[PDB]
From a paper:
The poly-ADP-ribosyltransferase tankyrase (TNKS, TNKS2) controls a wide range of disease-relevant cellular processes, including WNT–β-catenin signalling, telomere length maintenance, Hippo signalling, DNA damage repair and glucose homeostasis. Notwithstanding, our knowledge of the mechanisms that control tankyrase activity has remained limited. Both catalytic and non-catalytic functions of tankyrase depend on its filamentous polymerization. Here we report the cryo-electron microscopy reconstruction of a filament formed by a minimal active unit of tankyrase, comprising the polymerizing sterile alpha motif (SAM) domain and its adjacent catalytic domain.
TNKS2 SAM–PARP forms a double-helix of antiparallel, left-handed protofilaments. SAM–SAM head-to-tail contacts within each protofilament match those observed in previously determined crystal structures and involve the canonical end-helix and mid-loop surfaces. Interprotofilament contacts involve a distinct surface situated between the end-helix and mid-loop regions. The PARP domains protrude outwards, connected to the SAM domains via an incompletely resolved, partially flexible linker, and decorate the major groove of the SAM double helix. PARP domains extending from one SAM protofilament do not contact each other but alternately intercalate with those extending from the antiparallel protofilament on the opposite side of the major groove. PARP domains engage in alternating PARP–PARP head-to-head and tail-to-tail contacts. The head interface occurs close to the donor site, with main contact areas provided by helix α2, the donor loop (D-loop) atop the NAD+-binding site, the C-terminal portion of the β6–β7 loop and the β8–β9 loop. The tail interface involves reciprocal contacts formed by the α2–β3 loop, strands β3, β5, the β5–β6 loop and helices α1 and α2. The head interactions are highly conserved among tankyrases and induce an allosteric switch in the active site within the catalytic domain to promote catalysis.
Residue numbers in the entry:
A (entry chain S), B (entry chain C), C (entry chain D), D (entry chain E), E (entry chain R), F (entry chain Q), ...: 875 to 945, 950 to 977, 986 to 1073, 1081 to 1129, 1136 to 1158
The structure:
C-alpha cells in the first residue's frame, strides 16, 4: 500500500518501511495495532511506537467527518451437510408445510446459510426498534419467500424499493408460511413447461420481524404499513407483508426440484 | 459476620479485623475483591493482600464440590406508569385482543414488570436448547395466562408439577392468545357474584417459547409433548400448551377489574 | 418508589432505606450511581456500596434481554426571541422565499425550536446510513412542510404510515423549498373565508436528508423511492418527496398570519 | 420561562416549579448549574439534583447537532474620562499624526472603547492563523479608519463584503496611519459647508493584523491579497489594506470636530 | 534530538540520557508523556518523573507566547478500489452528471481520497461560522472543480488569493454540479489536439459550504460575496462561486481520460 | 539530598527516609507534593502527611524574606527542520529583506529557536508596561540584530549595560529591519578576508517592543530614550534603537554564510 | 501517643482509637484538624467531630496560661551548587572584598544557607522595631563575621551574652565589611602553622540591622549602644558593632581554605 508509505514518511519514520514491507502491514492493518502489536513486529523503541499511535489517532479521530476508515465485507454461503440437524429441521419445514406444480414433495438438493455482517446489523437494529415499540416483543417468525431478486438479496439484503407493486396487499415484500404459497410465484427458461420437473429453482427461508401485525381479510393496496402497526397479515393460507426492507433477513437459501 | 472472623483468624491476619469491621466487609463481599479493591479499603501491605486472595482462592476453587459460595436473589416488581409507551402497548393488547363476564373492555389498575435473574437464566437456557433443535428459531410468543399459583409463579417461576391436569389438551400449562379466554378461567371471594364488577383480578402476560408446535384439532390427554415437538397448539380461539415449566417466563403482572 | 424498597430488601440492606428516602433515591437514579455518588449521600461502608453496585449490575446486565432499564423523554419547544439572529434568519427565509391567499408577506407571530432526543437520534442514524451509501454526503436541506399531523410530528416525529396518498409523486412526505408552496396546503375553522387574514397557521421548517435524489419531470405514483435513490425531486417550483419518516427532522415550528 | 416548565414537567419534577419561579431560573440559567448551585437554591434531595443534571446533559450533549444552547451578546461602549492616561495617549496619536479642511488640530469631544466578545474571538482566531503562517508574528498595528459603516462595524465587526470597491488598491478595507488621511474620506448633512467646523465626525482607531504585507508603489486592483501575503502596504502617506474583515478590530470610537 | 539533551541537562537528570537514547525519546515525544508513560520506559523513581513533568509544564505553558510546541502534518492520498461502494458512487456522479470534447463517458483510471488534518479543521471551523449565521445550516454540497493549481490544493487547501480573476462572476473559486462543465476548463501538453483521448486529466470532487447563496442570473464581477450572503449561485448549467478558500475542502481526486 | 534528611529528622519522621531515598525525593521536590502526591509514594498514614505538609508550609511561607525556595533554568535551542513552515518564513525574511560583502543571497546553515522561561517573563512584563502606557499597543516588531555578545544574549538576555556606546543614535541596542544592515556589523577570525565566503557568522532575529518611538532624522547621542517615548526610530535604511535591555527577546538564532 | 489516648478517653470516644492509631494521629496533629480533616480520616458522625473539636478548643484556648501547645523546630542547612547564581554572588563578595596569611584569594569549598524559623521571626521583629524608630529604615546590610561560637549561632542565633568583651568598641558583636578583616580573627588545631593552607575555616555572611549607627573614630568600651543609636560604626577598614543578639541573622555558612 502507498497509503502507509505516505503516512510513515509524514511522521518521519521512513526507516521503518522495510519492517512494514516485510510484515505486509497496510494502513487498515496499522490502524488496529497498539503498543503490544507494534512491538511484536519489531518496533522496539518507545518513541517510534508513540509516534505511530498518535499519528493513527490524529487520522481516525482527527478527521471523523471525513470518515477515512475505509476498511472484507461480503456474503459467505455456508453449505449444510444433509446429515446435519439444522438441515433436517429446515427440510422438515419445507416438506411438511406443503399444502405451481402437480407435486406432493420436494427434492432438496442443497441448503446453504447466508452470513452477512452488515445485513445482520441492520436487521437487529430494526428488530430492537420494533421491540421497543411493541412492548419488548419483536414477534419474529421464519417464513418462505420467492422473488426475481434472490441472488441480489443474499448480497445486498431485502429492498422495499424493489417491491412487488402488483400484489394483493400493496407494494410490500411478501412472505408465506407455506412453501407452496411461495413457489407458486416462481416464473420456464429452457423447457417451456410451467411445471418443469428438471428446474433448478431456489427459495429463501427468511427471518421476518412482524411486530404489531394488522389482521386484514380483504384486499387493499397499502404503500406503507397501517398507522401503529409494523406489518400486514392477510387472509383473503395466510400471507405476511412487510414494507421495510431492513425488517427481514435472508437466513437460508434452499435449492430444490419439483418431485 | 463470624465467617470472616474465622477466615481472617485462620490466615493469621486478625489485626485487620478493625478494617473489616468498620467497612462491613463480609465473606460474600471479600470473595469478590482483588488487589485494587483490597487496597481501596486500606490493606496497604502486599503480603496481607496476597494472603487474603490466596485464602479466598483456596476456599472458592479448592472446595468446588462443596459449593461454599453462598451469595440477594428475588423478584423485583417495577410499576409501569400509565403514560409510558410500554404500559400503553400492553393495555392495547389487553383490550383489543378481547373477543367470564358480560363485559366489553377492562379497567386496567396497574401493570408491573417482573424481574428475576434466576428465572431469566432458566428461560434463556431452555430457549437456547429449543432454538438449536428448531433450526435456530425459538418461536417465541407473548400469551396471557391465569392460574391459582400466580403469586408463586412471579417468585419461583412456572412449574409443570403444578399442571392443569384436568385440561382439554392434557397436563400442561395453558396459555391463551386472547385475554378473554384467560379471564374465563378465573375462580368470587367477597361477593357471591361470578361477574363481580369490583373484583381485583390478576393476569399474567408471559413470554412463551413454543419451538415446533403440534397442530391439534381435537382433544387429547398428553402428559408430555408429542415426539419431535416442543409444544401443542390446539384449536378445538387458539390455545397453547407447554409441558416444561422453564419454557415460559412471567413477564408482566396485570391487575384490573371487569368493566 | 417501591421498586427500590424491594431491591434494597433483597440485598439485605433495608437499614439504608431512611437515607434512600430522605435523598429521594429511586431505582432509575440508583442505577447510575457509583462508589463516589453513593458515598456522597452517606453510604460510608465499603461493603454496602459493593453490595448495591453488584446488585445493580446483576439487574441491568444480568437481565439484558428483559431490558429492565425503564428510564423523562419528550419534546421541549424553545421560543426564539424576535431580536435573535436565528429568528431573523428563519424569518428571512420564510418571507423572501415567497413566490392560498392574495398576500405578499407574512406576519410572523412566534418561531419555536423543536428539541427531541429520540427523534434526533433516529434522524442522525438514518443520515449516517444515507451518507455511507452516497459517498459520504447526506445531501441535507431545510424545507418547509405542512400536514394535518403537526402537533404529532413535533412529538413522535415524521411517519410515512401517515403518507400523502393523494399526492402528485406518490405516497411520500412532501416538502417544498418555497414557503408559499407549503402554505397553499393549509385547510377556515371559525370563519368561512379561505383567505382568512386572522388565522393562526402553523408551518414546519424541517431538516430533510435527500441523499441521491431522482430528478422526475412528470407525475408518477411511487410507493417507495426508485431503486438506488433515497428521495424524489419533482419539477412538474420544485417539490421534494421522502418515503421514510426517519429521514427528516422537525426543526422549527412557525406560527404566523396572512398579511 | 415556559421551556423550563416543559423540561421540569418531562422530568416529572413539576413540584420544584415554585422554587424555579421564585428564583427566576430559566433554561439558560439551569444549564450552567451543578450540584452546589442547585443546592444553594433549595433543591436538597440528591435524587432531584441528579435528575436535573442528567436531563440537562441529555439536552446539551445529546443533541449537539441541534445546538439547543441558545444563550447577552452585544457591544458595550465604555467612555474614557479626559483625565485618563489612555484618553491622553489616543489624543496624542490623533493630534500628532496630522500631516479635508484648513485645520491644524482637532477638538476631541469623547473617546469610547468598543467591547464585544464575539468580534474579539474572531479577531484573535485570525490573529493566531496569521501568526502561525508568519513565523509567530502577527505584525499588528493600530490604524485609523473612516467608512459609511461605522455604527455597523462597532456592532457586527468589519466586513469585506462592504468593501471599498472604488479604491486605489482594490476592494479591500483601507486603514491609514495618519488621522488626516482618514478624515479626508468623510462625506455635509445640515450645512452645505464641506469644511464644517461644527460637524460631529466619528473616526475609528482600530487594531489591524497586517501579517506579511505586500509593499506596493503603484496602483492596482487586487480583489484579494496577493499570494503569500496577508495585507497590502501602498505608498502612491502610506495606506494599509486588508481584504479580510476578521483581520481588524474596532478598538476606539473617537468623536471630534474640525478646529 | 539535541533538544532533549539540553532539557535533561538543565533539569540535572543527565544520567537518564541512555534511557532516552535507547527509547528514541525526543522532546516532541517527551512533552506528551505522563507518569505512566514515563514509568513504562523505566523511569522508576518518583522524583525524576516529577522533575521531568514539571520541566515540561514550565516549557509548554510557561512560554505560551513563544509557542515552543513545534510538533506529522501532511496530505495522505488513500486510493480507492474499483469494487468499493464509494468508488462506484463517485463514478456514478462523474458519469451521470455529464451533459471540452466530443465524448459521452469517461475512463476512470483511479479515485483517491484526500486526508489532511489542518485543512479539515479549517473547513469545519468555517462551516460552524456559516452554520451559526444561516440558522444552523451549512448548505453543504459536493461539486466538481478544475484549476491549474490542483497539485497545490490537495496539499495547502483552497486559496482565494489564487482566484479566477478572469471569471464570469468575479474573482472567486468556481465549482460545477456537472463534471463536463468542470472539464471544459482544462487547458494539451504532449499532443497538439485539444480533445486528446490519451491525456491523464485530474479533477477534484470537492465539498463546498454555500450557506446563504445569492441567486444571480446575469453576469457581474464581485470581488467578495454580496452582503448578507456566503456564496453566489449564478445561472447565465448552474455554477457556484465561493470567495473564501477555507469554505471548500478537496474531498476526492479523480484521474481519468476522455472516452 | 542532605537537606531532606535534616528536614525529616527535625520533624521526627526519620523512618520515612528509606521511602524518600528510593524515590529520590529531594526538598525541591517535596515542596510541591500534597496529600495525593505523598500517598502515591507510600506515605499512607494521615499524621505523617499532615506533618510533612505543615513543615513545608512553615518553611516556604514562614521564611518568606529568606526566600528559601531555591529551585532547571536555562536556554533550550530547538532546531527547525528546513522543510518546516517556520523555517521557510524566517528564511524568506532573511533573504528577501536584503538590500559587508558583494553577495546577493545567504546560505542558511541552520535556524534555532531560543527558549528561556526567565527572559520571556522579563520581556512580557516590560511589554505589559509599555502596552499600558501606549494605549494598549506594545508596537511589537521582529528585527535583525548583531552584537559581539551573541552567545551571551541567548543565555542571559539583552543587556543595555553592554550598550553600543559608539553608535549613531547613542548608547542603545541597535536593531535593523534589513538583514544586510545587520550583517554589515560583523567584525575575520581564520581567513584574513573580511568578506570570507566560508565563515559561520551568526545573527539574531529578535522580537522587540518599540512602544511609542521618537522619529529622528539626524544623529544624536541619547543615553536614554527621549521623554515620553520608549524607543528611537532613526532614518539618517531605518534602524531601531532600544535603551532598555528587557524590551527585546532573542527569538531565533540564524547561522549562515555569505553566498 | 498516650496523650491522645487520655484525651479521647476523657471525651468518651475510645471507640475511635483504632482510627487514631492507624492514621498515626497525635495530639499535636489533632489540634490542627477541623471538620474537613476529621472527616477525611473517617469520623463520619457529626456528634463525634463536634466533641473532638470542642475538646481541643477547651484545651488550647481554655488553658492559655498553661501554654499546653507544645508542637519540628531546627536549623536546615541548604547547600548551594557552585553553578548557582546565588553561590556565584556570595563567592564574588567573599573574594573581591579582600584588601591571617599572605594569601590573595580563597578556595571556596561549599556555601550553605541557614534556614531557621524562630531566629527569622526574632530578627524580623527587631527589624520592625528598629524600622519604626528610624523613620521606616532598618539600614540593613550583609556583613561577614567570625566567632568561636559558629555551630552555636546557626542553631540558637546570635547572643550578646557571648559578647566579645575584649573588643575595640566594647562588649558587642563585631561584623566586618571585608572578609579579610573577619578571617584575621580565626584562631591551628592540627598543624602548628597559624597560616595553615589546608585548614577548613568557617565564616558567616550574616544579615545585620544597623538602624541609626554612631560614627566613631576612636576606641571606647561601650557596654550597650550609645543613646538614640542602634549600632556603632568604627573606623580606627570599617567595622560594625551590634549590642543586641536579635539584631542580626546568620544567613550563609561559608567553608573555605587559604589560597
Ligand atoms: Zn426446465
Ligand atoms: Zn367481589
Ligand atoms: Zn377566520
Ligand atoms: Zn455642518
Ligand atoms: Zn495528450
Ligand atoms: Zn573565514
Ligand atoms: Zn593543618
Amino acid at each position: 500500500d502507498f497509503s502507509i508509505t505516505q503516512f510513515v514518511r509524514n511522521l518521519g519514520l521512513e526507516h521503518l518501511m522495510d519492517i512494514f514491507e516485510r510484515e505486509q502491514i497496510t494502513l487498515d492493518v496499522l490502524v488496529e495495532m497498539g503498543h503490544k502489536e507494534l512491538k511484536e513486529i519489531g518496533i522496539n523503541a518507545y518513541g517510534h511506537r508513540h509516534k505511530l499511535i498518535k499519528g493513527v489517532e490524529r487520522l481516525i479521530s482527527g478527521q471523523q467527518g471525513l470518515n477515512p476508515y475505509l476498511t472484507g465485507s461480503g456474503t459467505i454461503l455456508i453449505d449444510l451437510s444433509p446429515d446435519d440437524k439444522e438441515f433436517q429441521s429446515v427440510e422438515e419445514e419445507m416438506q411438511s408445510t406443503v399444502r405451481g406444480g402437480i407435486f406432493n414433495r420436494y427434492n432438496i438438493l442443497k441448503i446453504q446459510k447466508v452470513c452477512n455482517k452488515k445485513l445482520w446489523e441492520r436487521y437487529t437494529h430494526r428488530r430492537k426498534e420494533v421491540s421497543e415499540e411493541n412492548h419488548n416483543h419483536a414477534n419474529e417468525r421464519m417464513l418462505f419467500h420467492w422473488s426475481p431478486f434472490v441472488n441480489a438479496i443474499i448480497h445486498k439484503g431485502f429492498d422495499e424499493r424493489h417491491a412487488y407493486i402488483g400484489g394483493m396487499f400493496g407494494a410490500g415484500i411478501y412472505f408465506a408460511e407455506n412453501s407452496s404459497k411461495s413457489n407458486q410465484y416462481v416464473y420456464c427458461p429452457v423447457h417451456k413447461d410451467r411445471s418443469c420437473y428438471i428446474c433448478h429453482r431456489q427459495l429463501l427461508f427468511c427471518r421476518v420481524t412482524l411486530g404489531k401485525s394488522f389482521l386484514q381479510f380483504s384486499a387493499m393496496k397499502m404503500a406503507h404499513s397501517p398507522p401503529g402497526h409494523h406489518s400486514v397479515t392477510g387472509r383473503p393460507l395466510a400471507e405476511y407483508v412487510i414494507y421495510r426492507g431492513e425488517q427481514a433477513y435472508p437466513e437460508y437459501l434452499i435449492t430444490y426440484q419439483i418431485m
